[PDB]
Amino acid sequence: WTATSGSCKGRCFELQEVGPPDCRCDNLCKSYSSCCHDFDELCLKTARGWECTKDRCGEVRNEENACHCSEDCLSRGDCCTNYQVVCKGESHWVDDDCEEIKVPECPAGFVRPPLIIFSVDGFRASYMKKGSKVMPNIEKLRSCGTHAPYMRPVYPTKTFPNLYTLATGLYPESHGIVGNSMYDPVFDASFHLRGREKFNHRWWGGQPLWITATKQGVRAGTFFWSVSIPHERRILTILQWLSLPDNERPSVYAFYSEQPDFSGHKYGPFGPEMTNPLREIDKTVGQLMDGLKQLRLHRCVNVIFVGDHGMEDVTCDRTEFLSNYLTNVDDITLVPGTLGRIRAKSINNSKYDPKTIIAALTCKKPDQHFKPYMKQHLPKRLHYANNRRIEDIHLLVDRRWHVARKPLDVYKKGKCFFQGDHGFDNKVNSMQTVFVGYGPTFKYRTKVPPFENIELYNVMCDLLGLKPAPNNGTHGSLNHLLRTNTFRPTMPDEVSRPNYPGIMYLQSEFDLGCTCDDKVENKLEELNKRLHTKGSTKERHLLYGRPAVLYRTSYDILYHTDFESGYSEIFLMPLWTSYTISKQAEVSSIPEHLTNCVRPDVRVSPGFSQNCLAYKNDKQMSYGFLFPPYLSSSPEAKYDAFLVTNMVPMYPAFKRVWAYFQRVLVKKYASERNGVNVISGPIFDYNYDGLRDTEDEIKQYVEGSSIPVPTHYYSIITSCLDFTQPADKCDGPLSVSSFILPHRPDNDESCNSSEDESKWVEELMKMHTARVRDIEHLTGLDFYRKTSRSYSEILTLKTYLHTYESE
Ligand SMILES: *[C@@H]1O[C@H](CO)[C@@H](O[C@@H]2O[C@H](CO)[C@@H](O[C@@H]3O[C@H](CO[C@H]4O[C@H](CO)[C@@H](O)[C@H](O[C@H]5O[C@H](CO)[C@@H](O)[C@H](O)[C@@H]5O[C@H]5O[C@H](CO)[C@@H](O)[C@H](O)[C@@H]5O)[C@@H]4O)[C@@H](O)[C@H](O[C@H]4O[C@H](CO)[C@@H](O)[C@H](O)[C@@H]4O[C@H]4O[C@H](CO)[C@@H](O)[C@H](O)[C@@H]4O)[C@@H]3O)[C@H](O)[C@H]2NC(C)=O)[C@H](O)[C@H]1NC(C)=O
Ligand SMILES: Cc1nnn(Cc2cc(C(F)(F)F)ccc2CCC(=O)N2CCC(CCS(=O)(=O)c3ccc(S(=O)(=O)/N=C/N(C)C)cc3F)CC2)n1
Ligand SMILES: [Ca+2]
Ligand SMILES: [Ca+2]
Ligand SMILES: [Cl-]
Ligand code: NA
Ligand code: NA
Ligand SMILES: [Zn+2]
């Protein structure tokens, strides 16, 4: 109930929300059906429109008017945004030459530069270039301020997850808005764009920017706008708030536009009908900037122009139907469209079996346009699993396609209407969106590389002098956007220091069931090999310092001619293995006599070693090596690669992948990049939280042993950004690509896996591309500790994702 008999007189667009049953006058009151009876009359004036004309200049103030052109309007803060242009001979902001904003030029009484977030729904990244002729205000912001070529959204590339990520710095799995539609099995409640459940605060986790601000004494405008409030009124409202007394005036504001998304769905991303929405958004930006100029705030305020996601061509004829694959289609519930999420229709149906559903949806049609996954098997870069609102079965849909349950869902929602959609994998080029920063705190005429939207919350906090709530950004990685207010972090402290074991065990102390034909024998070279075991080549293979271990454990550094490792006594394998392969390196074979060779490591106790008998007995499990024997520097050095301390458990299906990577791709990358440094290792994430498992979280061991089975294998592949310098003699910035491969007992993910590995392995690896930061979370290791480069530059490097998309 709402007693709508209260009044909005003196309350239009009030900032504090008054509680039920009292009636509301805030910018969301319409969405709750809660506005006071006179809200439209008093707060949504439209009389005479949005622009001054020559005949209105110096008029007598008429309070019915939407905006004012009377002499008093500037002091009242309610002039039409073109008032000074029409009535005082001033220029529009867009017609003024760009001039660097070296310091904030703010009115007296401003404690900090305000921040205005100008958010646009469905604003695809390529609109900045492709629409530039029709968007002169936006183009001035972009060219004179700080811009990225694109900004990466979060998956799913839908509106509610992305706007909330922008607000919080959190992945959807952590903030809880995992889709525009959701079922929470604990609440037994459904969240939908239509209806009232979405207003319940229990859905919305983390701490959004407006709350972070308010808790730290920084006043915030209300970010949300009911759809019926015209954009001109949203801008005039912000400009009015900026005219409030110092003790009442907010420091942070958001504008939101439903365009160009609304038209994009109807017309496709580049339909000819899209020009007009882009023009109208640009006009709105011009109103804001002219309005700020009138208030002498255009060189005071920091402006962010930012999108939530892009827009792809999608039509209803490009729909896959689950009814063509499943006999049991009426026993499932599907969340459909540009992603799929499947659960049982009834929790009482004991016949429901996810394994059978997955198999029925796997590689069944030659050009099949979706791929099913258990959520823990999704690419780790999506960070889309650790929430009870995310169904176990997920369908990753190809760009340009939909999935639906039955055809009647698509023609009873007899043809269709729409030409655009979004939601796909967040590395897809059509899903990328925009970022521009303009103001005293941003840099001048500066391009920055693409970055992820999870990073922006920290920067918005920096811009307002706020301490960010705990989030998934890497604070510092966007310092290069800012003139001032940079955040200067310190590297994390190493928690566990390594042991450096020497030769401590005799061969006969080992009873591991291993064998090797290595009984083949010099003072010159005996000293030389001792030096290699003491670390004499470590400078070549450990180029950026050893990784730091950020948790309590027991591990050993092991040195070798061709590679260095940090060997875990607890997990009985390396945490990391580091090696450098020059451009001129030669690939060799595993010699016949060493095919099944595994050698005890006399530096490491039998008790802290793997054993070969476990692998013989485990009929499902084989092994591979972290440092590849194919890339040994010499036949004598190759023996090091068969140490038991370089062995890791691998399913035979996975060994196909790993062997191709090691034998073919590493050398290819070294040839292309002028040497590479590789750091490889295991990952254990049995609870799919994106974080390193403790020992007691491990669900699978090599049969009969205490050898834990990794859920994934990573590699970090680093070289010189200036590829005219070899990786091992690089003077400047670095270049990286990484992956986190799922350690699966089949290659069902790869529909062409019966073919030669040259036709499918690299496609797999691209799908499982990763940031170094992702590997850091999953391992508790901290990389790049010892470089010549600034720490903030290294943080940027660690957040890089190699996406493998064209320009
Ligand atoms: C991305 O950034 C974020 C933010 O930094 C990282 O997320 C954090 O990760 C931590 C580890 O997973 C996690 O720490 C736990 O916090 C528990 C207290 O949590 C509440 O309070 C916080 C603070 O206000 C609040 O933010 C939380 O919000 C979550 O839950 C609500 C629902 O109540 C949601 O609305 C909200 O969206 C959010 O959900 C997300 O996180 C939860 C986990 O908290 C997930 O389950 C959801 O799916 C969703 O992802 C909470 O309201 C605290 O109780 C935990 O302590 C247990 O574990 C430690 C291990 O160190 C152990 O020592 C303790 O004894 C304790 O164990 C006991 O409870 C166990 C479980 O019942 C039981 O098994 C044991 O036997 C013990 O009795 C823990 O410290 C932190 O909350 C989240 N924060 C957020 C915002 O998500 C995230 O990791 C980053 N991601 C990556 C990839 O880097
Ligand atoms: C999602 C989401 N997450 N964060 N935001 C805010 C935001 C953040 C940022 C950025 F970049 F800075 F981060 C820019 C612009 C905005 C404003 C978006 C806006 O005006 N919109 C129009 C209203 C619409 C639906 C509202 S509703 O579902 O009916 C509803 C839903 C929920 C609520 S609520 O209960 O108040 N939500 C509370 N929390 C904690 C988010 C109200 C509501 F009306 C959303 C789009 N939106
Ligand atoms: Ca959107
Ligand atoms: Ca984990
Ligand atoms: Cl296979
Ligand atoms: Na085996
Ligand atoms: Na396959
Ligand atoms: Zn949309």
Side-chain angles (χ1 to χ4, degrees), residues 1-412 414-520 522-807:
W1 184 269
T2 302
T4 68
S5 61
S7 171
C8 287
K9 184 179 123 59
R11 296 169 60 198
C12 284
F13 296 105
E14 65 191 355
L15 298 163
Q16 287 161 46
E17 198 187 322
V18 307
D22 299 38
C23 64
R24 282 168 64 167
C25 307
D26 60 283
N27 55 10
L28 270 182
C29 69
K30 292 284 187 174
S31 299
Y32 290 70
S33 297
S34 61
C35 313
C36 302
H37 71 274
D38 54 3
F39 181 82
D40 289 339
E41 179 184 3
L42 294 176
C43 309
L44 302 173
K45 290 162 175 167
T46 60
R48 307 206 69 183
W50 310 114
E51 291 174 12
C52 290
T53 54
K54 283 143 184 165
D55 62 276
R56 296 188 56 188
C57 299
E59 69 196 358
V60 177
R61 169 170 286 262
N62 183 336
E63 306 281 16
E64 284 184 347
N65 287 324
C67 51
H68 306 281
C69 312
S70 45
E71 207 65 25
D72 60 10
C73 70
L74 288 169
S75 54
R76 285 288 289 280
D78 60 14
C79 308
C80 305
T81 63
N82 75 339
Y83 168 73
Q84 292 204 138
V85 169
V86 174
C87 305
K88 300 296 206 280
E90 260 289 1
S91 47
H92 288 284
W93 174 85
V94 69
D95 296 315
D96 300 332
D97 295 338
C98 293
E99 298 292 321
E100 180 168 16
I101 308 164
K102 293 185 189 156
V103 297
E105 302 172 14
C106 295
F110 278 73
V111 70
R112 65 189 66 80
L115 174 60
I116 299 173
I117 301 154
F118 192 107
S119 66
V120 281
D121 202 323
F123 202 110
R124 182 170 169 165
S126 62
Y127 293 158
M128 297 297 291
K129 195 154 278 167
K130 301 172 68 66
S132 62
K133 270 68 148 70
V134 306
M135 303 186 304
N137 286 277
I138 291 161
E139 171 61 21
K140 180 179 170 180
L141 291 175
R142 186 208 66 76
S143 63
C144 299
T146 296
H147 81 285
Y150 60 93
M151 182 180 70
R152 185 177 311 111
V154 282
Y155 185 78
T157 54
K158 299 290 195 174
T159 303
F160 278 41
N162 277 275
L163 291 172
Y164 204 55
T165 285
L166 284 164
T168 61
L170 293 166
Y171 299 120
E173 70 178 3
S174 293
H175 65 55
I177 309 304
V178 307
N180 286 346
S181 163
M182 312 178 266
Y183 176 65
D184 183 311
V186 170
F187 303 161
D188 177 45
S190 284
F191 180 109
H192 301 299
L193 291 180
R194 309 312 187 189
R196 301 196 72 75
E197 183 53 46
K198 76 192 185 273
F199 300 119
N200 194 316
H201 289 187
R202 71 187 170 176
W203 294 92
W204 302 85
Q207 192 185 88
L209 183 66
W210 54 93
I211 303 294
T212 305
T214 300
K215 290 205 204 279
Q216 293 180 51
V218 173
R219 193 165 310 98
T222 49
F223 278 38
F224 299 84
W225 302 89
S226 297
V227 70
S228 53
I229 299 161
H231 292 186
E232 297 90 342
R233 171 60 56 204
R234 302 179 197 187
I235 293 300
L236 287 161
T237 299
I238 292 165
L239 293 169
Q240 194 73 66
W241 287 332
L242 280 159
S243 296
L244 288 166
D246 298 334
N247 76 326
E248 294 177 48
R249 177 179 59 245
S251 293
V252 61
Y253 303 87
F255 170 86
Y256 174 70
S257 168
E258 305 83 1
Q259 288 285 34
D261 179 88
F262 176 80
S263 286
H265 282 282
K266 292 171 92 305
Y267 305 120
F270 307 111
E273 302 84 353
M274 298 302 298
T275 291
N276 284 332
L278 298 176
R279 290 193 185 280
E280 290 301 301
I281 295 162
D282 195 74
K283 182 175 192 176
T284 302
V285 174
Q287 289 175 356
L288 173 63
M289 300 310 295
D290 289 349
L292 292 171
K293 189 178 162 179
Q294 296 205 127
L295 303 177
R296 302 189 286 107
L297 287 172
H298 66 304
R299 299 170 57 81
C300 173
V301 170
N302 287 308
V303 178
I304 290 171
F305 183 84
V306 65
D308 54 358
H309 55 69
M311 187 65 72
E312 176 61 278
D313 294 286
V314 187
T315 55
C316 76
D317 66 312
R318 291 196 295 273
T319 306
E320 290 268 7
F321 297 101
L322 295 190
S323 56
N324 293 329
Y325 298 82
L326 302 182
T327 50
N328 59 275
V329 83
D330 299 324
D331 291 341
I332 69 172
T333 289
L334 173 70
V335 181
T338 56
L339 47 153
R341 312 206 301 275
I342 295 173
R343 62 186 186 276
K345 184 147 175 104
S346 169
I347 53 139
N348 303 144
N349 174 30
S350 60
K351 250 97 283 160
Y352 177 87
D353 188 352
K355 294 152 189 277
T356 66
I357 290 154
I358 297 287
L361 294 170
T362 298
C363 309
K364 292 290 144 92
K365 306 287 151 65
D367 297 317
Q368 182 172 315
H369 301 282
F370 67 90
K371 185 179 300 301
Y373 287 82
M374 294 303 294
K375 63 182 185 167
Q376 69 268 27
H377 291 152
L378 286 167
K380 301 294 273 175
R381 64 185 169 79
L382 299 177
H383 294 284
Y384 197 75
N386 185 212
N387 198 291
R388 72 202 183 205
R389 298 163 190 173
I390 301 167
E391 288 75 1
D392 290 345
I393 299 171
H394 201 76
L395 310 182
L396 282 186
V397 182
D398 290 355
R399 68 192 78 186
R400 302 167 48 86
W401 285 79
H402 275 174
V403 64
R405 197 168 64 90
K406 293 193 292 194
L408 65 83
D409 297 343
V410 172
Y411 62 83
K412 314 282 267 196
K415 270 169 161 154
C416 340
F417 355 87
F418 68 84
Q419 300 179 252
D421 210 352
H422 52 89
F424 305 104
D425 183 336
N426 65 332
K427 76 171 172 73
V428 165
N429 268 346
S430 55
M431 296 299 95
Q432 309 308 295
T433 187
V434 297
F435 174 81
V436 178
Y438 176 95
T441 315
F442 284 107
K443 292 179 178 201
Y444 175 66
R445 297 191 176 275
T446 292
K447 194 166 55 181
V448 302
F451 64 87
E452 300 189 333
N453 71 350
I454 60 172
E455 301 300 332
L456 278 187
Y457 173 78
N458 284 330
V459 172
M460 293 186 295
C461 290
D462 292 338
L463 290 169
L464 293 163
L466 300 173
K467 180 180 187 175
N471 72 88
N472 305 125
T474 294
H475 202 173
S477 73
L478 295 187
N479 279 352
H480 63 287
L481 282 59
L482 307 173
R483 177 186 297 274
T484 68
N485 300 23
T486 55
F487 176 80
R488 292 297 174 186
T490 66
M491 291 184 175
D493 291 324
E494 179 152 35
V495 171
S496 292
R497 68 181 156 283
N499 305 297
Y500 296 86
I503 299 186
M504 295 151 172
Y505 300 91
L506 298 174
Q507 180 83 18
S508 67
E509 296 185 73
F510 296 88
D511 183 18
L512 302 179
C514 299
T515 68
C516 182
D517 179 18
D518 63 352
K519 311 296 172 181
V520 185
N522 187 24
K523 285 177 179 170
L524 311 151
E525 303 187 14
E526 270 173 28
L527 183 47
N528 210 36
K529 76 183 187 196
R530 277 170 265 162
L531 295 183
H532 293 341
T533 305
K534 301 245 184 161
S536 81
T537 67
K538 79 191 156 184
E539 319 312 329
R540 175 82 192 296
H541 297 304
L542 199 71
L543 295 186
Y544 326 104
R546 65 178 176 75
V549 170
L550 310 185
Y551 59 99
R552 183 66 260 159
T553 202
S554 177
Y555 82 105
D556 300 308
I557 301 289
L558 306 178
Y559 297 117
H560 324 73
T561 304
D562 297 337
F563 70 101
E564 183 179 334
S565 66
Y567 180 83
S568 173
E569 296 194 329
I570 306 307
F571 286 73
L572 310 172
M573 65 188 70
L575 301 176
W576 57 261
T577 298
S578 182
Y579 59 99
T580 299
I581 302 303
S582 73
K583 183 180 180 159
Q584 298 79 35
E586 210 174 337
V587 173
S588 61
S589 69
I590 289 171
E592 282 184 50
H593 77 282
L594 301 180
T595 301
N596 296 310
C597 169
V598 179
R599 298 170 61 240
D601 190 333
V602 295
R603 301 166 294 193
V604 173
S605 80
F608 294 134
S609 297
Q610 294 178 45
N611 76 87
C612 293
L613 184 60
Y615 291 100
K616 187 166 181 297
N617 293 345
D618 190 327
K619 297 298 190 269
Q620 307 315 303
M621 188 64 67
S622 184
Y623 63 87
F625 291 108
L626 290 171
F627 171 75
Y630 317 109
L631 297 174
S632 58
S633 60
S634 76
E636 181 177 293
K638 200 188 285 282
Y639 286 89
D640 298 344
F642 302 96
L643 289 167
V644 73
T645 48
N646 186 43
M647 183 171 60
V648 288
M650 291 189 174
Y651 291 116
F654 190 74
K655 289 175 62 183
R656 295 182 67 197
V657 173
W658 190 248
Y660 188 74
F661 164 62
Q662 291 197 316
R663 187 179 60 79
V664 181
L665 300 175
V666 173
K667 185 52 216 167
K668 180 166 94 179
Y669 307 148
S671 293
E672 295 171 347
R673 299 170 55 173
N674 196 2
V676 291
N677 175 259
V678 179
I679 303 176
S680 302
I683 277 162
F684 307 85
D685 194 20
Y686 277 98
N687 63 354
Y688 52 86
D689 66 358
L691 309 171
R692 175 196 57 95
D693 286 357
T694 57
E695 315 163 42
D696 66 356
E697 296 178 322
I698 301 310
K699 299 180 64 55
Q700 185 183 339
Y701 291 84
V702 184
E703 187 171 311
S705 78
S706 287
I707 307 166
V709 178
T711 58
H712 300 80
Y713 283 98
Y714 70 89
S715 294
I716 299 166
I717 306 171
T718 311
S719 66
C720 202
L721 185 68
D722 175 5
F723 52 76
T724 70
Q725 296 191 325
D728 66 345
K729 301 196 209 74
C730 180
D731 290 328
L734 304 176
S735 181
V736 70
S737 61
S738 306
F739 61 77
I740 301 162
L741 281 169
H743 182 213
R744 289 185 52 182
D746 57 67
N747 289 296
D748 289 357
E749 188 179 356
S750 296
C751 295
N752 292 322
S753 65
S754 67
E755 300 173 41
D756 186 70
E757 286 85 355
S758 60
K759 308 301 188 216
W760 64 272
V761 167
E762 212 174 5
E763 168 180 340
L764 183 64
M765 290 170 51
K766 294 182 193 182
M767 184 59 31
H768 293 280
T769 190
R771 311 176 305 144
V772 173
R773 201 84 180 92
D774 296 325
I775 293 163
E776 293 188 337
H777 301 316
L778 283 159
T779 64
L781 301 174
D782 188 67
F783 302 99
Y784 304 124
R785 305 277 294 178
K786 304 288 206 190
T787 74
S788 50
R789 313 303 306 166
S790 99
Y791 185 43
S792 292
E793 181 190 301
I794 289 304
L795 295 176
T796 306
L797 187 66
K798 293 180 170 188
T799 66
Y800 180 77
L801 188 68
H802 196 74
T803 51
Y804 297 101
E805 291 279 298
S806 61
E807 292 182 342

